Write a protein that binds this ligand. Sequence first.
Ligand code: 3BJ
Ligand code: MG
Length: 519
Amino acid sequence: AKETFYITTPIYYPSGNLHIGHAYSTVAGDVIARYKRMQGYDVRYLTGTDEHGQKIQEKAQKAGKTEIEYLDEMIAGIKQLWAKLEISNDDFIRTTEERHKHVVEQVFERLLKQGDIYLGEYEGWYSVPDETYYTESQLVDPQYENGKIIGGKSPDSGHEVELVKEESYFFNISKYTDRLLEFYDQNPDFIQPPSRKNEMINNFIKPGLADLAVSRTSFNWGVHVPSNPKHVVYVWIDALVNYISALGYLSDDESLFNKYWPADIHLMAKEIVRFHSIIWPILLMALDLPLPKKVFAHGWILMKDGKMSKSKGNVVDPNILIDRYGLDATRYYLMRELPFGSDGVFTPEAFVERTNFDLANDLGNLVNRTISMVNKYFDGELPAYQGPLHELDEEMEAMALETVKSYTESMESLQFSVALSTVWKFISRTNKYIDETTPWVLAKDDSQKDMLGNVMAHLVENIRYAAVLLRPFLTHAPKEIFEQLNINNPQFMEFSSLEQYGVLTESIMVTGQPKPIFP
Ligand SMILES: Clc1ccc(Nc2nc(NCc3nc4ccccc4[nH]3)nc(N3CCOCC3)n2)c(Cl)c1
Ligand SMILES: [Mg+2]
């Protein structure tokens, strides 16, 4: 077998308007997926949607549609974005799918039988419009009476909160506390970034874990608890098991599950990392199922006003960006501007600057300079590579291998903006190499055609290296670079083709008519 690799994005909630940060997750998952497939893994890459709850019932009803009708339309639009981003997801899990709903049912009923889930009462500070409960310390403008909390406001919307008591099934999770802590100890790389682990052991595990209310009686649109249909499965169990339902767990064909579980990486935004680090492995322990090998939270893409939403007036539509500026530009900015363990920022100015200077100038003009010259000096015939003939070739070819080495180390540690900048260090140095070798000077001396060709050989081989490294990130530039150069063998486009510098042992006819990589 190709060794398997299973990567996931969270399931998105179909409110209707998607930012660059929802886009960030799918694009990054895609970079990981494309990269793993290039390394020879049997990849499965999952995304999908969280389709249940009170808020969808309401959305549907305002739009004047049934839930499904409303849902199908939100999802058509979601899947359209991911097609337009060229997300290489192998499947798309909808929580409204029988395959998912059947898992939810069975999972719930089993934890009931085991005695992990019990009937009690939830009490909390509820916000009607937010469809969300808040802790006393999360309240804004709290109201006190003789030292006791009596009311306050939602920190999201600022609507008044109201104390609600309600009947809930509860999943007893603190019973798995010491196992979880042992699982963290035996799996040190589990939580990425790892600085995220202690804040969580501190803030959430050691206080320690409260029983989790996992159903409600207050909505209809959702998976009903079979032994008790008045109760509907709340977000925790419904959303998490997306990752195992998509694989045919507990169906009649569990081959995908047997093949791909456990996941190698759950990728997520930081707001739900706690849920995937604590609740999720505990639920898996309760099901006697293997735990995922890694969970990775990325930061947010912020503005100058500051975090991104419909409300502040700071929403950026990935869609218009692809249209305005091109696909490769958009994918590039997102991956290039979000460091591991940090938030990033969208400025229209920063965007155009990164697209112009990195992509169009550094890369695009290296390619056009190089073809122009092969066409001026050799009428389109690129002399086959020979060896490191020029004083600078030996350390430049070393730099090419060092580029690939340092890129791979960044790709494995999830440090994408660093893998990209490393490639661009090599990009720039290849541009420097034209200035250094001044081919036009060589071109005037007939006894220098060998060296001229050596210089050209290097430039192209340097371009080819950068195109291969960029393939997980950019779905257009690399292919269009290989065509322009008339590198037409699929093998010369793979990672293995980078182990030894100078791979074009025969003459090739670069394009007569080179156009911009980035228009
Ligand atoms: Cl893969 C994945 C994706 C998301 C999440 N978390 C997550 N999602 C959502 N979505 C909206 C939402 N509301 C829902 C109601 C019923 C069923 C599914 C519902 N989904 N809402 C929350 N809330 C946490 C507490 O405040 C209120 C909402 N948490 C998890 Cl744990 C896993
Ligand atoms: Mg009822």
